[PDB]
C-alpha cells in the first residue's frame, strides 16, 4: 500500500520523452542496440534486481531511454529506408516475428550499418549469457543475522549432571 509517509517522485520528473516505437521496430535493430547500450541496461537491471524499488534507479531508467533514443536517432539519420524495409519484413513475414523468416533485408540493413558506423552484428546468443560489469554505485549490505538475546534455552552438554537427590522422589521408590 501507499501512504502519506512514503515519498514518491513528482510529476515533473516522470514527464520525459519515452520510446514510442512498436514491437517490430524494436525487434528490428535489437542486436545493434545492445552493443551501444550495454552499460546502461546492465547497470539499470542490476540495481533493479537488488534494490527492488521503482523509486530507485530512476536516473538509470532515464539513461536507458536516452541511450535507446540516441541509437534510434543515429539509425534515423543514415538509411532510414533500409530499417523501414527490415521492420516491415519482420512485421509482415510471420506471426511471432522470427529473424529466420527473412534474412535478405537483415543482410541489407547490416550492410548499411557496417558501411555507415562500422558496427558488426553480434552473435545469436550474445545477450542471453550472464553479463558481468563494474558498477559505480556501491553494493547494498547483506542483512545481519537476526538476534534473539532471550531465546528458548536448553540444558547444555557441558553442564554437570550429579546423581539425583533421593532418587526419583516419586511414590516411595527411592
Amino acid at each position: 500500500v501507499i501512504t502519506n509517509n512514503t515519498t514518491l517522485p513528482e510529476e515533473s520528473e516522470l514527464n520525459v520523452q519515452e520510446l514510442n516505437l512498436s514491437s517490430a521496430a524494436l525487434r528490428a535493430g535489437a542486436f545493434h542496440l545492445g552493443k551501444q547500450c550495454e552499460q546502461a541496461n546492465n547497470e539499470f537491471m542490476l540495481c533493479r534486481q537488488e534494490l527492488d524499488d521503482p523509486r530507485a534507479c530512476l536516473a538509470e531508467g532515464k539513461a536507458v531511454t536516452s541511450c535507446a533514443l540516441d541509437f534510434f536517432r543515429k539509425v534515423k539519420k543514415t538509411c532510414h529506408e533500409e530499417f523501414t524495409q527490415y521492420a516491415t519484413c519482420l512485421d509482415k513475414s510471420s506471426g511471432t516475428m522470427a529473424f529466420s523468416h527473412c534474412r535478405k533485408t537483415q543482410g541489407v540493413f547490416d550492410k548499411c550499418i557496417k558501411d555507415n558506423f562500422d558496427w558488426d552484428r553480434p552473435s545469436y546468443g550474445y545477450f542471453s549469457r550472464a553479463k558481468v560489469i563494474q558498477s559505480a554505485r556501491e553494493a547494498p549490505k547483506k542483512e545481519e543475522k537476526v538476534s534473539y538475546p532471550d531465546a528458548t534455552p536448553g540444558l547444555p552438554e557441558d553442564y554437570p549432571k550429579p546423581p539425583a537427590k533421593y532418587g526419583s522422589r516419586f511414590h516411595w521408590l527411592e
Binding site: 534455552p153 540444558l155 553442564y159 554437570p160 549432571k161 550429579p162 546423581p163 539425583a164 537427590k165 533421593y166 532418587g167 526419583s168 527411592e174
Partner: protein, 115 residues
Amino acid sequence: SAVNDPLELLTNKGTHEPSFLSPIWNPIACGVAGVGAAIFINWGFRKPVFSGIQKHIAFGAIGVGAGAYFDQKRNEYLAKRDAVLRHYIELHPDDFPVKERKTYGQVLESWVPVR
C-alpha cells in the same frame, strides 16, 4: 540453615546413602518375573513347571540384563531431570527467590478444640 535456598535444596550434597536394594532390586525383580513367566508358559502348555530350564535361564538372563540397562537409563534420566530443574531455577532467580524461614513463635494459627 536460616533460609530455604532452592539451590541448596536441590544440590545433592551426598549425605543420602543409597539402600542395599537400590542397585540390585530391579534386576532381581525382572529375573524373578522372567523365571515366573517361563514357569507360567510351562504350566499353560501342561508341562512340568521346572521341565525346560533353558527357557528359565534365558528368561532370567534377559530379565537381569534388561533390568540393569533400564536401571542405568533411569539413573541418567533422573540426573538429567534434576539438572534441568536446577538450571531452570538459576535461569529465573526472580520467580524462585530466597525466602526467610519463619518459626512458630511468629505465627498465630487457629487451633481446633473439641468439647
